[PDB]
Design a protein around this ligand. Structure first.
Ligand code: A1IFQ
Lengths: 805, 805
């Protein structure tokens, strides 16, 4: 069909059909008479997976033979999405399978919709892990993703009566054709117990054992014949009245049962601590076994462990435990190895996200790790005291141990102390780390602190989800950009090219029709395809300020009612994302969005000039549908709160213009494109700080802005909940009296900036030319660039995009 | 190698090796460098399973096209054992795979030892189900086995300190290459709730739903191209704080977690009741769907439901529930259909085995079924009252409702009332049913009561486990006997044939060396291969009288110590079998066996003249090893207690002579061979009854038998437990004062009969000639004969051993 999707060679298609039919017969045990579309999806998935196997085996053999330094990306989350299209793209098989299935009478895109997302993450951090796996394989790194094979990923969200309802994400119900169970590589993980100090040294005894069974999933690089591994551990009860004892095996196996759905929030649940140690303990056993199959001097030359947030921070004391207690290294040598092995990525400054585990919980579950943590703290604070003699407050601030009613271990402090590199995920965030929350650590060890601005893979996030845009780009500049995204800057040459302008707008219109067709087919929801698609998709949080979007939406509605005869650019305002189950405010915000829609979408004076829709069950596969259809990308977090963002980058790559604050990677996106090509508004970090310094008074904004006052009175008086007039009193009260994110303070600039958005959209040519200037400068935000930096600046390995044989 | 194992055709071997290597590469994702023997086993298993798929699909299509009456064998247990060798035997692939794997450098028998038993049964009843599936496929019946896919089968038994320890039988740990999950055929099963009576009729509402997911396993007939299905249901939570709710999905899924390990004993556990309804409800939905894909007049013409014991007895009220409540048939028409559809097989007369569920438990879990059961009872008792006017005691005795402190439903009475056929499992047992425990039901409906003497499949139980014996037989009479076992009578012609006599003894000696090698390799246990192998393997129960064997073993030991210089036939006495976890006496009996061995096996005066060994973890695969090696088959249950037995038949088919009571199918085995060819001893049923009539006094036997008195004093005084002198006081006390199975009353005849056993074994030629007379007359005990009778006398279908194309 389109060239970026590869060749449908005659023999390749013939072989694909034969292997499809073989799987249908021998694997699905069906013939065409009874085969369901799901049977067809699985026959195709097995056929495509078969094309990975040779390279997968040879890649891993190649690493065994050449012994490169191995990169271990440890994460509690791998937000992978679906795998069938990604595999075909990266194997150059997409047109061939499309033709093969077409000749069999099947629509391959219909089959693709049958695959369950591997929804093993919450949001940005977990999706970063997924993009990173893709980029590390495309860059030829000997890299392994290590995580948990959750039986249930992030919950499936249903909207019922305008409210979020959570259902179990039973993604393995029909099996997983991608993974390969490796029950022969199963390893014991220990919990509880107690420490004996013998003549040999310390001994961790009387533990309860949980087995960790690895499942390996292939990670294909982009057309370089590299296939790396994602290894996900599954909890299994050890082999050794009767019925209840068998049933009680469920308790240990609950360790890998379900992903904790807290996006940016720490709740010290013991089961979550168990999950974190589970990944850490089994993974480090793997790492050490592989290292010995090559004395621990060389260990940091052969192993990098990257900690995705503090979630696997126990790797630092676990590595010490293994090196000291089992390998009998001296403490100082073991510590030198550990710090040189480990590096730590921080993802947020919000204090409620910081993992601060109660000491008594650690003492019970992991008694030897708490001892090692205390020893780490004593030695680290001795270094602090020697560098800053007499600075007692600095000692208290830097300690891994936090005092209080509940004594706790600060896992971020543990990570900094035990890592040779610490990085934030965007320039502004990494500077904030050095300036504020880790300033003490930066002053002790400035060399540790780095920036690694996040990115997204242009395979999943352009070639896969927006083949039309990838094609019109390739028609001009070739296909090299797909793994060399800075070549998109060549498109600045085409900013006055009438053909490209036409094609960019044509592609966007096709994507919008496709998304409108999706909403009609799957939900019987009708959206005006000739409206500006205004999209805010991301997890629901106060700091991301979906509520500020809500205020603007009601402003548009109230201005229409005030002057019904005045032309306004028609909009479909779309908001989607999941709220954590126990986050009352976030669930109220979802209900407000649907409640606004219930009024707006049924007002005959409004008609199709304005519609407000909550996109249900936002997840990786839905992001791939809606982001290519978006005109306006809402990135409106309070300045200083969004460490980087990555949804912002997806929209930029896919031809939406961005309205946003100078926050996270927005800053660098605007720098890359030129601020004249972004709708930047609102307080900067400095202005937020000035408000905090004098005290944020929302009443002052209410008193001075009639249009804002009108909206608050509508919320209070029940205008958006006539049957329950005080339904939204908590939102109103938070906004008026307890708003940590200063919604009102950006209201006026936001509404006026939104006016400028509409003004440009009335000029289709100039809208599209500004779009070109964004797409053309999105190259910096490829995760290949991010990974190349991690490789050279932290891991000490040189990337390579050369083909394996 | 040997002809009964088929042809190793040149192209077949070449194709097998290619498909082996394809599976190793694409399915196991290994190359030969790293492949474990388990990888090799799985590559072979997939290769062999691939050879079933075409016939499996075509068999089931054939049934769809020809619409024969379908047989549904409902059982809570399918004691299947391993599947790889059985599949190769029945597909005529065994020599070809043997040669193919040999050319790849692999020992196929080593690979076979890697397969986990599908241990989904307890003993005779569950193994009968497995043999029946094999025979119904070999006889061309459109037959389906329906059961539960237990995550954990019968526990793995370890002997530790001479005691049984139970471990979870994690048979699915490495997967199951045989089964095909059918998650698309998943069905809802309902529990709890309540009954509404509307205008339409009754309605079962407010239930909790458990999903039943079917897994299909192929059942190959013997070289007739028939492949039937065993469908096993797996419990799954329905699709619709948060974390605990996800974890609590385990509660519904516990329904299929583990097989209840009670052999012959009813404990009214609610979870077991749930399992029973689970199989019943999902299976009958399948049956009805398949029936509609062909008005319910014709339903009994198209459906037979065979109830394996009372365990799926809820099928009777469930079928009524569906026909009346959902299909809106009148009660009387629905009842006519039900009784003509259902038939019931009874497996034991022991009262403690009878399922008698508390009415309050049924009312809570299955409120509509209890209503239907009460209505069934009222109408049935009305028939009783009309046939036997004024016989009020008969009404009380026959009622489905049993009065008492806890009111209960007698599930056997439900089965008789709701079934057009009731059968026992051996002639003596089926007569006892008509004479005693079901005499009232027999007098009301004599036409209902049948016999179907049990049998065993000669595929698994001769060709598979004893290929040497199968070969020397085939060398004389051809291979037709393998599915026409009455042709073994041709071997009576060879009773004076020196070559056959030589070969029979040679085969037995090879099997004994092979089993001795097994015990050395797997347990470092040394047995004298030139000793008589005296084997009692079966579940441990008082009624099977392992204790009587114990008394004889100690007698042999005490006689040796009394006259050390006197020659005795050397024996290896082997006892194996599992005790139910909560059955104290059975566990004490295992400990006594090992305690006897601890004295006997270490007495230098005894040496290798006598050894006593407890065979650990007796299961189908171990039965296949030890039964072909046995010289003497211990079948010594108290007359009247063993309904049939089937282990007795396995030994007879495999060249052991039998010592036993006139009990169960022993009677018919002795009738078939001639009593002169069996070591029959002990009380007959009539003598047991005479003892009960006057009261069994064990003291009288103790007082009159010095050698018995000596053994009891050794047990009491601690001779077999010096470190815990009163370890066996409970056994002694039961024997002396509470022995329901009259161990002492058969002691003298047993010991003297055992003398006759030894006397014949001293004459190898006459021992072997008597063996020939047993093997030659074992043909009646083929489960093909049993199934042919079920087909013609209950199900109304005609068997056929003709090939499918
Ligand atoms: C070598 C090659 C071209 C091929 C040719 C022929 C057959 C066949 O059976 O006629 C093949 C199967 N069989 C086959 C296919 C599916 C199945 O379930 C069993 C066997 N598989 C194959 C593919 C995937 C596997 O996990 C295992 C083998 C492969 C086959 C792989 C390869 O494409």
């Amino acid at each position: 069909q389109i060239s970026v999707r590869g060749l449908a060679g005659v023999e390749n298609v013939t072989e694909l059909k034969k292997n499809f039919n073989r799987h249908l017969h021998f694997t699905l045990v069906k013939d065409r008479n009874v085969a369901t579309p799901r049977d067809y999806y699985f026959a195709l998935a097995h056929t495509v997976r078969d094309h990975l196997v040779g390279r997968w085996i040879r890649t891993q053999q190649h690493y065994y033979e050449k012994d490169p330094k191995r990169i271990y990306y440890l994460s509690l989350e791998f937000y992978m999405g679906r795998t069938l299209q990604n595999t075909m793209v990266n194997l150059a098989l997409e047109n061939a399978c499309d033709e093969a299935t077409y000749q069999l009478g099947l629509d391959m895109e219909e089959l693709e919709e049958i695959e369950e997302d591997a929804g093993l993450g919450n949001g940005g951090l977990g999706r970063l892990a997924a993009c990173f796996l893709d980029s590390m394989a495309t860059l030829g790194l000997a890299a392994y993703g290590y995580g948990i094979r959750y039986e249930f990923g992030i919950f499936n969200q249903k909207i019922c009566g305008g409210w979020q309802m959570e259902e179990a994400d039973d993604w393995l119900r029909y099996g997983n054709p991608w993974e390969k169970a490796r029950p022969e590589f199963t390893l014991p993980v220990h919990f509880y117990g107690r420490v004996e100090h013998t003549s040999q040294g310390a001994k961790w005894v009387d533990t309860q054992v949980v087995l960790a069974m690895p499942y390996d999933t292939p990670v294909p690089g982009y057309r370089n014949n590299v296939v790396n591994t994602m290894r996900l551990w599954s909890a299994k009860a050890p082999n050794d009245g009767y019925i209840q004892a068998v049933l009680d095996r469920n308790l240990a196996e609950n360790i890998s049962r379900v992903l904790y759905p807290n996006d940016n929030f720490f709740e010290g649940k013991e089961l979550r601590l168990k999950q974190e140690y589970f990944v850490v303990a089994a993974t480090l056993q793997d790492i050490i076994r592989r290292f010995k199959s090559s004395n621990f001097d060389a260990f940091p030359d052969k192993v990098a462990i990257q900690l995705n947030d503090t979630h696997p921070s126990l790797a630092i004391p676990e590595l010490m435990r293994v090196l000291v207690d089992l390998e009998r290294l001296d403490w100082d040598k073991a510590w030198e190895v550990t710090v040189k092995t480990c590096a730590y990525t921080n993802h947020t400054v919000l204090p409620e996200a910081l993992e601060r585990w109660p000491v008594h919980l650690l003492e019970t579950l992991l008694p030897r790790h708490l001892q090692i943590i205390y020893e780490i703290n004593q030695r680290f604070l001795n270094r602090v005291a020697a560098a800053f003699p007499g600075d007692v407050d600095r000692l208290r601030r830097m300690s891994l141990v936090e005092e209080g009613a509940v004594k706790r271990i600060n896992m971020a402090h543990l990570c900094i102390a035990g890592s040779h590199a610490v990085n934030g995920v965007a320039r502004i965030h990494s500077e904030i780390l050095k300036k504020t929350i880790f300033k003490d650590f930066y002053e002790l060890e400035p060399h540790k602190f780095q920036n690694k601005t996040n990115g997204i893979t242009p395979r999943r996030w352009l070639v896969l989800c927006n083949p039309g845009l990838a094609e019109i780009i390739a028609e001009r500049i070739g296909e090299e950009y797909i793994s060399d995204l800075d070549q998109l800057r060549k498109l600045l040459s085409y900013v006055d090219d009438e053909a490209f302008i036409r094609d960019v707008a044509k592609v966007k219109q096709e994507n919008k029709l496709k998304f409108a067709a999706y909403l009609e087919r799957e939900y019987k929801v009708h959206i005006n395809p000739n409206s500006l698609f205004d999209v805010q998709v991301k997890r629901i949080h106060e700091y991301k300020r979906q509520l500020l979007n809500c205020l603007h939406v009601i402003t548009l509605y109230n201005r229409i009612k005030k002057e019904p005869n005045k032309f306004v650019v028609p909009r479909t305002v779309m908001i989607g994302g999941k709220a954590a189950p126990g986050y009352h405010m976030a669930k109220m915000i979802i209900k407000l969005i649907t409640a606004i829609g219930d009024v707006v979408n049924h007002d005959p004076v409004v008609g199709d000039r304005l519609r407000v829709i909550f996109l249900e069950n936002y997840r990786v596969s839905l992001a791939e549908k809606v982001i290519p259809a978006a005109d306006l990308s809402e990135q409106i977090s309070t300045a200083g709160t969004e460490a980087s963002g990555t949804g912002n980058m997806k929209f930029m790559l896919n031809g939406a213009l961005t309205i946003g604050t100078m926050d996270g990677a927005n800053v660098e996106m605007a720098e890359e494109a030129g601020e004249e090509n972004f709708f930047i508004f609102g307080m900067r970090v400095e202005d937020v700080d000035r408000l905090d310094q004098r005290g944020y008074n929302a009443q002052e904004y209410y008193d001075r802005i009639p249009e804002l006052r009108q909206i608050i009175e509508q919320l209070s008086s029940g205008f958006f909940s006539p049957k329950q007039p005080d339904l939204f009193k908590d939102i109103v009260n938070m906004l008026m009296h307890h708003d940590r994110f200063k919604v009102f303070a950006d209201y006026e600039e936001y509404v006026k900036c939104q006016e400028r958005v509409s003004a440009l959209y009335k000029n289709p040519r100039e809208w599209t030319r500004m779009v070109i200037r964004n797409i053309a400068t999105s190259g910096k935000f490829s995760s290949d660039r991010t990974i190349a930096q991690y490789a050279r600046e932290i891991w000490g390995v040189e990337p390579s995009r050369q083909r394996l044989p």
